[PDB]
Amino acid sequence: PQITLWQRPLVTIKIGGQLKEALLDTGADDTVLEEMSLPGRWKPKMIGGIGGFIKVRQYDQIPIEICGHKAIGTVLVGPTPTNVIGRNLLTQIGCTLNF
C-alpha cells in the first residue's frame, strides 16, 4: 500500500494469534508493544523516547504479521503509550519513505 500521513498510520498486526492495532513509526529503531504474553526467554532493554527512558522485555525471533505482511523479529514489551512498529520490522516488510 501507499499510506499518507493526514491521519496516524495505524495498521492491524497479528501476533500470538491475536489482532492488535499498531502505529508505523519510522522514528523508532525498535518495535514496542503494550503488555502482553510472549513465549520463551526475554532479555532486558532500556529504551529512550521523548519523555525519558523505560525498561522493556526483549523477545527475539517472534512471528508478527503487519498489514498482512509476514515478519519475524525482535519485539519489546513494556509501558509504551501505544503499540509502535519500528524500523527493525518496517525493513522486513519492504517499507520506504517517498516524496
Place this chain on the structure above:
Amino acid sequence: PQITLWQRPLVTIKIGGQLKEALLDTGADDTVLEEMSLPGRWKPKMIGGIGGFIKVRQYDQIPIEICGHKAIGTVLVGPTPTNVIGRNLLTQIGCTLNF
C-alpha cells in the same frame, strides 16, 4: 526521493535561518525541535511519548524547508532528546509510506 529505513531517516531542515538535522517520523503527531529561538507568538503544550511528557512551546505558521521542499506549520520547541519532523509537516512535502 525514496528513503530506505535500514538507517534512521535523518534529513537537513532549514528553519529560522538555521540548518538542523531531524528525523522523519511517521509516528509523530507533531514536529518537535531542541531549544531554539523562533519569532512570533507561542503557547505552552505538553506532549507525550515513550517515557512520559515534556513541556514545549508551540509556534504556529512557521516556514520550514525539508529536503528542498518548502512548507509551513506548527513547530514545537523544548527539551526533546532529538529533533523530530512529524506528520503535520510530512503531509505538506507529500511524504508517504510505501510497501
